[PDB]
Design an enzyme around this catalytic site. Sequence first.
Site, PDB file in Angstrom:
ATOM      1  N   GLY A  17      32.502  32.627  48.563  1.00 33.87           N
ATOM      2  CA  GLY A  17      31.528  32.767  47.444  1.00 33.87           C
ATOM      3  C   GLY A  17      31.155  34.056  47.323  1.00 33.87           C
ATOM      4  O   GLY A  17      30.097  34.331  46.540  1.00 33.87           O
ATOM      5  N   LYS A  18      31.785  35.185  47.619  1.00 35.65           N
ATOM      6  CA  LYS A  18      31.417  36.600  47.363  1.00 35.65           C
ATOM      7  C   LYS A  18      31.315  36.931  45.853  1.00 35.65           C
ATOM      8  O   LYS A  18      30.524  37.510  45.331  1.00 35.65           O
ATOM      9  CB  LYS A  18      32.407  37.602  48.295  1.00 35.65           C
ATOM     10  CG  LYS A  18      31.996  37.740  49.711  1.00 35.65           C
ATOM     11  CD  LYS A  18      32.622  38.747  50.442  1.00 35.65           C
ATOM     12  CE  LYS A  18      34.155  38.580  50.152  1.00 35.65           C
ATOM     13  NZ  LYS A  18      35.084  37.415  50.631  1.00 35.65           N
TER      14      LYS A  18
ATOM     15  N   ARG B 139      47.850  35.712  51.556  1.00 32.77           N
ATOM     16  CA  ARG B 139      47.969  36.389  52.720  1.00 32.77           C
ATOM     17  C   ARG B 139      48.627  35.703  53.853  1.00 32.77           C
ATOM     18  O   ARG B 139      48.329  34.397  53.843  1.00 32.77           O
ATOM     19  CB  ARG B 139      46.601  37.116  53.299  1.00 32.77           C
ATOM     20  CG  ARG B 139      46.248  38.676  53.033  1.00 32.77           C
ATOM     21  CD  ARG B 139      44.948  38.966  53.483  1.00 32.77           C
ATOM     22  NE  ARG B 139      43.872  38.013  53.467  1.00 32.77           N
ATOM     23  CZ  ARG B 139      43.531  37.142  54.207  1.00 32.77           C
ATOM     24  NH1 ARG B 139      43.971  37.112  55.561  1.00 32.77           N
ATOM     25  NH2 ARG B 139      42.396  36.540  54.067  1.00 32.77           N
TER      26      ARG B 139
ATOM     27  N   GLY C 189      49.134  39.380  46.386  1.00 33.24           N
ATOM     28  CA  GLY C 189      47.894  39.932  46.723  1.00 33.24           C
ATOM     29  C   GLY C 189      47.708  40.834  47.833  1.00 33.24           C
ATOM     30  O   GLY C 189      48.099  42.139  47.876  1.00 33.24           O
TER      31      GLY C 189
ATOM     32  N   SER D  60      45.209  30.817  43.505  1.00 34.40           N
ATOM     33  CA  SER D  60      45.342  31.642  42.375  1.00 34.40           C
ATOM     34  C   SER D  60      44.427  32.505  41.997  1.00 34.40           C
ATOM     35  O   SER D  60      43.137  32.314  42.349  1.00 34.40           O
ATOM     36  CB  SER D  60      45.768  30.567  41.214  1.00 34.40           C
ATOM     37  OG  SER D  60      44.880  29.671  40.906  1.00 34.40           O
TER      38      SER D  60
ATOM     39  N   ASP E   8      34.235  42.712  47.150  1.00 32.84           N
ATOM     40  CA  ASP E   8      35.073  42.177  48.227  1.00 32.84           C
ATOM     41  C   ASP E   8      34.913  43.348  49.241  1.00 32.84           C
ATOM     42  O   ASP E   8      35.196  42.993  50.479  1.00 32.84           O
ATOM     43  CB  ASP E   8      36.498  42.202  47.634  1.00 32.84           C
ATOM     44  CG  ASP E   8      37.416  41.454  48.304  1.00 32.84           C
ATOM     45  OD1 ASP E   8      37.268  40.577  49.027  1.00 32.84           O
ATOM     46  OD2 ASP E   8      38.490  42.197  48.769  1.00 32.84           O
TER      47      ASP E   8
END
Length: 620
Positions: A287-288, A85, A234, A402, A309
């Site tokens: 860390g989600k 992003r 992404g 990545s 997410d």
Amino acid sequence: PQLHNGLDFSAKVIQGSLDSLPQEVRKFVEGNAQLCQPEYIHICDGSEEEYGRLLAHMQEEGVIRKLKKYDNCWLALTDPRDVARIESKTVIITQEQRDTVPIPKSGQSQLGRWMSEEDFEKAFNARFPGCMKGRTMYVIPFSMGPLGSPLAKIGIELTDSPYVVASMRIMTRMGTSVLEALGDGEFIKCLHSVGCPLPLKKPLVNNWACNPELTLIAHLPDRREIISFGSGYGGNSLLGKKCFALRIASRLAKEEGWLAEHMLILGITNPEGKKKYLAAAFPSACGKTNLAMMNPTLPGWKVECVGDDIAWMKFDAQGNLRAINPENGFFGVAPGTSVKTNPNAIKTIQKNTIFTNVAETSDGGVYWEGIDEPLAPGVTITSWKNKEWRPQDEEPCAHPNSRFCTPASQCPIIDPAWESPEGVPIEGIIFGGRRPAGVPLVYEALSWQHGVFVGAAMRSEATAAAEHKGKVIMHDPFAMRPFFGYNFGKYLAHWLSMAHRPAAKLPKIFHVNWFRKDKNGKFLWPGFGENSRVLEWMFGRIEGEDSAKLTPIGYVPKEDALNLKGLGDVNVEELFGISKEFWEKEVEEIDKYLEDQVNADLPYEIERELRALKQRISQM
Ligand SMILES: Nc1nc2c(ncn2[C@@H]2O[C@H](COP(=O)(O)OP(=O)(O)OP(=O)(O)O)[C@@H](O)[C@H]2O)c(=O)[nH]1
Ligand SMILES: O=C(O)C(=O)CS(=O)(=O)O
Ligand SMILES: [Mn+2]
Ligand SMILES: [Mn+2]
Ligand SMILES: [Mn+2]
């Protein structure tokens, strides 16, 4: 009608029919085809046959490589300038700037980038005319949320990138059945181009078409349009994800009375056969996904993943906050994923998965930093730069941002209600980020208003997911700083207004810090599956257990209320230490940030919590 043959694109349709499209969808396709001038138009049906053809095509063009070690897995390598992003080129267009960001007191706003409609019109005309020359325009009909869910929204993405099409097939619900569900209903209009019309003026790095100089990701909430140019990567190109399901959707949620948040959703079951659902907002790279897919170390406990997410949430008639995951897959950070840190991810990504910018092993596998898995003799590594790589170089073999892109239904612990159109009832909300110092392992908010303040006060050291560097602690309220669709002050009033609803069953609000360090620079907490011990405490607090003590910053576990058995030498004093010196500086930084950045749109209840915290700390 027409006087010549310039406007009807039927003769360029290589799959599907313009005639079979709903009239407003056809207008959207043909009007942009006239503008972008694609050579072919492919209306996606979402079939397995179509997917096989796209893969075969991309392999023949050198865009992707087959990973022969696994079952239907593929590797794509990008231009090294197109790897994340780009927050600085992501803009929101409203007539009045105050709709998009609060007018700051003195600084520049960090809570969004506003662009006037007249300025966007110039940026658009410099980019899109003729941009798809010689390429196929793919028409992607997709649903965010279960195809039929009340909170489900439908979008159409136009793109000239088959990599986007393939990834959207995994990340969303895509194809002909969405068109049937849409009918003549409203849809979000998504326009994407990599910005490389043929013939090529610039040869391509790694066969990856992109236009970094002209990259622009634009949102027009009043027109329900997302327009993205120059990046294939992404969150810039898969427009259903960040652009639609957070930025556009948070504005819709404000208008319609719900919430669109940067949160995982998990269900956790205890050894007494009770199950609760929790949501957690951590910033990118904090860390989600590791928490949503956790393998708990505590016996008798089970974690199931609803999403990792994006959460869409709303009170139902009974006053339960209900969440759905609008996505259809996981787009997770690859480096650091191992059998130790995220075993359930390892099981998920070995089939039907697209990897972007990881390393390839000579026997057809994947490699990245932290995979923690030794290779056999004679196996060599090709880095994400398409070069031979030995662990003697200084550079990593996989880009830090990545990603794998994998179907959610393949996750061995996917929750049985992850596609339920009615959502799961949320009983706790977790906030947190990377704080090396000062911030304890877990605390619980004193009230709804204090919990909203805790979300607003979130800070985290800079990661590799936007475009930031240095060892800097930045503000990321609600983990939503890059994703606000509208004025953050109004977003806070929206959250605070949930406490005004009748029969509203407000969840408990917690803040965690997995990342506190000692004077050595080593972590104090093992994390990953051991975070189940913190969730156990939260579970009991939601049930009403008398397991907390009051501190100036909120409730923390009582000594011996945390199951620390087996960890041995964990420094409980340092993990839960609360220093007056640290928190006096912290409240001042929060005060300066909210005064400048939210200014006249700061709700009084949030200022009142800031004052109350300042007072509790002064009395230490
Ligand atoms: N020290 C420590 N690191 C963790 C823990 N959980 C996750 N991480 C690290 O955090 C990095 C990013 O975690 P993710 O779960 O992929 O981040 P995410 O919040 O889902 O980020 P986005 O998908 O970009 O929104 C990983 O490389 C992990 O190594 C933890 O409990 N302790
Ligand atoms: O940046 C994030 O939080 C992501 O989940 C990755 S992207 O979808 O933004 O590329
Ligand atoms: Mn060719
Ligand atoms: Mn994210
Ligand atoms: Mn993630």
